[PDB]
């Protein structure tokens, strides 16, 4: 896991001493929440694909620096924060149901430009 | 669509209820405004002005228009209470400097072309 950093450089972003287990539990939680979303939902398919790719990366790479380099999400604490943000987003999407058809078409020339 | 969404009130009675609450708040505020701003008017004069401002919009029947009028009235009340307005702002409801404009046909005909 390499030498533990003294700082993440970013204010308010504390160093995670156990980033691998953190990411594993976050990604498994995300995959749990997506299981409730219908199979045909584009959000479910896309987020499952990216979440399982990231989880497989967190499993094929022990060292934190090479994992950070492969993830392309900044530092590992930033990756963890993004995982929490995606977990929150999936929980909200479970209630919003954006896979449903469009609520209402706009008026006839609502977006016509120029008028 | 055929119908529209409300601001707050789903009916005209709800709009009237909020109008009455706002009128109550303004009526109680008037003496504190007269004292605090050191206005040279009487509390009867200020409360009659509040009533006359309310009476301008008595013809409104749309509950959403009534709701927006209540919102703007509460905004004005909060500018008055928090002393964000100056004395000049409070005294602008009373057009003391503007001369009495003509109203009958003959005087308007005498002074110019405006209907």
């Amino acid at each position: 896991a390499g030498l533990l950093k003294k700082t993440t450089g970013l204010v308010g972003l504390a160093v995670c001493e156990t980033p691998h287990e953190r990411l594993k539990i976050l990604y498994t939680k995300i995959l749990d929440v997506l299981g409730q979303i219908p199979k045909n939902a584009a959000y479910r398919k896309y987020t499952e694909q990216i979440t399982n790719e990231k989880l497989g990366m967190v499993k094929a790479e022990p060292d934190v620096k090479k994992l950070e380099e492969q993830l392309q999400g900044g530092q590992i604490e930033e990756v963890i924060l993004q995982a929490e943000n995606e977990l929150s987003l999936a929980r909200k999407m479970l209630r919003w149901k954006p896979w449903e058809p469009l609520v209402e078409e706009p008026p006839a020339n609502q977006w016509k430009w120029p008028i | 669509g055929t119908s529209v969404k409300p601001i707050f009130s789903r009916d005209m009675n709800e709009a009237k209820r909020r109008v009455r609450e706002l009128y109550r708040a303004w009526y109680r505020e008037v003496p504190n405004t007269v004292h605090l701003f050191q206005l040279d008017i009487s509390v009867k004069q200020g409360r009659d002005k509040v009533r006359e401002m309310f009476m301008k919009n008595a013809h409104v029947t749309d509950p959403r228009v009534v709701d927006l009028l209540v919102i703007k009235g509460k905004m004005e009340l909060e500018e008055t209470i928090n002393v964000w307005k100056q004395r000049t702002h409070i005294m602008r409801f009373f057009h003391e400097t503007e001369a009495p404009r003509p109203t009958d046909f003959l005087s308007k005909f005498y002074v110019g072309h405006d209907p």
Binding site: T7, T8, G9, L10, V11, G12, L13, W113, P114, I115 | -
Partner: protein, 310 residues
């Protein structure tokens, strides 16, 4: 923004002039910000020393445009007119001595135990909370966020110039002050390359339906006279559309959302000023601070109300 909507390109010399005077402008703005911050704190002396340099840069502005402050010099299509002969020499003479003045400014503030007592751990903002509050520029990089429009989204010839982006670590007033001082140093560094790499050529797009022709052609050629007339009475028509273009202004990200309906006048022009979002965050950054700290927090968000209020 207007050139993006017009689908036209300013000439290379105009772009180099624009970058050079943008960095001169950054020096002017950072001098004003740091020195007025210090003057509000109670260090009045650095204000005068650096306002002499500001006066010299005002002279550069006036020599290129005829106005000390409001040049109206950079225009859609390029710049109004070319640099007068000998201007680059004077800019070089000024810039070769300016770092010594930054040194003297730091000799009074950077290590002073009273200046640090008024700026260290004052107005601390979290990086994520800086992002969510819409902060930009030094208010972002003070919290360690590695973001600069001149590098991530370069404009003009900024991709051809080499410089450093100073990054803070504590997100307080002291780190932001250090960032602004080092930005002055990197502005000098950019200005040197602009002086050495200024190319020949015209300084406005050679397309007389956007940029007015030279006065000599206007008085000799029929097309030039017609286009001068029309550009100075109706203006050029901009193809219909909307854009949001932003630059790395000295005070943060300055942008405009410019709507065109196809005519010669803008349909809508929303101006994005970094100071608006920064001053929206004064309440957050002043939490649990004394009254004298709010003066510092306002100074560290450097606020010009001309762009806050528009």
């Amino acid at each position: 923004a207007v050139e993006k909507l017009l689908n036209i390109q300013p000439p290379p010399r105009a772009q180099w002039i624009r970058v050079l005077f943008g960095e001169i402008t950054r020096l002017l703005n950072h001098i004003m910000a740091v020195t007025t911050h210090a003057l509000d704190i109670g260090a009045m002396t650095p204000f005068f020393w650096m306002f002499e340099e500001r006066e010299k840069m005002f002279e550069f502005y006036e020599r290129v445009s005829g106005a000390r402050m409001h040049a109206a010099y950079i225009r859609p299509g390029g710049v109004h007119q070319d640099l007068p002969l000998g201007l680059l020499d004077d800019i070089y003479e000024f810039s070769k001595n300016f770092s010594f003045r930054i040194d003297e400014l730091e000799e009074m503030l950077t290590n002073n135990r009273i200046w640090r007592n008024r700026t260290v751990d004052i107005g601390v903002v979290t990086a994520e909370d800086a992002l969510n509050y819409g902060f930009s520029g030094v208010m972002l990089r003070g919290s360690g966020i590695q973001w600069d429009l001149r590098k991530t989204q370069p404009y003009d010839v900024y991709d051809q110039v080499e410089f450093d982006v100073p990054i803070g670590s504590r997100g307080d007033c002291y780190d932001r002050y250090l960032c602004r001082v080092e930005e002055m140093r990197q502005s000098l560094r950019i200005i040197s390359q602009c002086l050495n790499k200024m190319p020949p050529g015209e300084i406005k797009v050679d397309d007389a339906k956007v940029s007015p022709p030279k006065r000599a052609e206007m008085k000799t050629s029929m097309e030039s006279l017609i286009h001068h007339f029309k550009l100075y009475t109706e203006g050029y028509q901009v193809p219909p559309g909307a854009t949001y273009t932003a630059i790395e202004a000295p005070k943060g990200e300055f942008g405009v959302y410019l709507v065109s309906d196809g005519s010669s006048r803008p349909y809508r022009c929303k101006i994005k000023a970094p100071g608006f979002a920064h001053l929206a965050g004064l309440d957050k950054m002043s939490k649990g601070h004394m009254l004298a700290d709010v003066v510092a927090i306002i100074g560290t968000q450097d606020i010009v109300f001309g762009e806050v209020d528009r």
